[PDB]
Amino acid sequence: PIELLPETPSQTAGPYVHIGLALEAAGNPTRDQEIWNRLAKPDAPGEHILLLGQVYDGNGHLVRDSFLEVWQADANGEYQDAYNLENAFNSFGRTATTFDAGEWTLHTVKPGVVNNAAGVPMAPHINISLFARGINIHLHTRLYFDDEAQANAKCPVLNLIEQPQRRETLIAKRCEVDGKTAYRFDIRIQGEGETVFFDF
Template sequence: MSVELLPETPSQTGGPYVHIGLVLTAAGLPERGQEIHNILARSDAPGRPITLIGSVFDGNGHLVRDAFLEFWQADSEGNYQQVYNPENPFNSFGRASTTFDDGEWELHTVKPGSISQGSGKTMAPHINVSLFARGINIHLQTRIYFEDERDLNEADPVLNRVEQIERRETLVARPIGERDGRTLYRFDIRVQGTEETVFFDF
C-alpha cells in the first residue's frame, strides 16, 4: 500500500484581515461586549499619563496602513497586572492598529515603572510590543524605551544586548509635546531597511 504525501500548506501572513477579528471598529464592524482597546490607563490610574503615537514603515519607506500591534507593560510601580479587567483603572495589556488614512497608531497609558529581574538587575521603563502585518509570517517583537529615562536606559540589561550602540536608538520613544494633559511620545517602527527597528527573539 502506497502512502501519498501531501504538500506543505502555504504559509499565511498576519495581515491584512487581522482587524476583522481583533480591531472591529477599524474594519467598520460593531464592537463586542468586551473589547481590548488602546487605552491601558483610565484618568484615575496612578502614575504619569502618557500618549504614544507612531507609524509602521516597510522596507521601501512606505506606510503600513493595516498593521496591528499588541502592548504589554508594567504599571507605574513596575508591576504587571496578570488578569485583564476593563473595570480596572489600569491594565497591562492593550491593542492598537494603524489607521487606513494616515497610517498612525495611538496608545493611552501611564509611564511604566522600572522592573527588577530575578537576577537583581533593573530594567528601564519600557513597553513590550508585538507587531502583526501583511507580509509577516510570524509576528515581530520589540520594545519601547523612553528618551527621558537615559540613565536607566544605559544600564538596562536587554538594551545593552544590542551590540550596535547606534541601533539602540531605534527602540527609543521621544517626547514631542503634550496633548490633553498627557506627555506625547513618538515611536515609529521600521520593518526593514537601513534604519530597521531592533526586533527580539524572546
C-alpha cells in the same frame, strides 16, 4: 535528543486582521467588551502619557494594516495580568494603524522599573508585538523613553544589542500633544534605521 510536540506554526495575520481583533477599524459593530488602546483610566495612578507612531516597510512606505499588542508594567513596575475593563489600569492593550494616516495611538501610564531574572533593573519599557500582512511571524520589540537616559544606559536588555547605534532605534521621542505628554515611536521593519526585533 528529546523532542517535544512541535509548536503550531505561525501564519500572517493577513490584511483583514481587524475583523477579528480591531472591530471598529474593520468598520464593524463591536461587542460589549473589547480589548483596545486605553490601558489606563483617568483615575489611574502614574504619569498618563499618549504613545503614537507609524510603521514603515523596507521601501520607506507606511504599513497601513499593522496590528499591535502591548504589554507593560503599571507605575509601580508591576504586571497586572488580571484583565478587566473595570480596572483603572490594564497591563495589556491593542492598537492598529489608521488606513488613512497610518498612525496608531495608545493611552497609558509610564511603566515603572522591573528587574531581569538576575536582579538587575531594566529601563522602563513597553513590550510590543507587531502583526500584519506580509509578516509570517510577529515581530517583538521594546519601546524605551528618551527621558530615561540614565536608566537606559544601564539596561541589561538594551546593552545586549552589540551596536550602540542600533540601541537608539528603540527610544521613543518625548513630545506634547494637546498640551499632553506624548512619545513618538516609529517602527522601521527593514532598511536604513531598521528597528531592533527580539527573539526570546
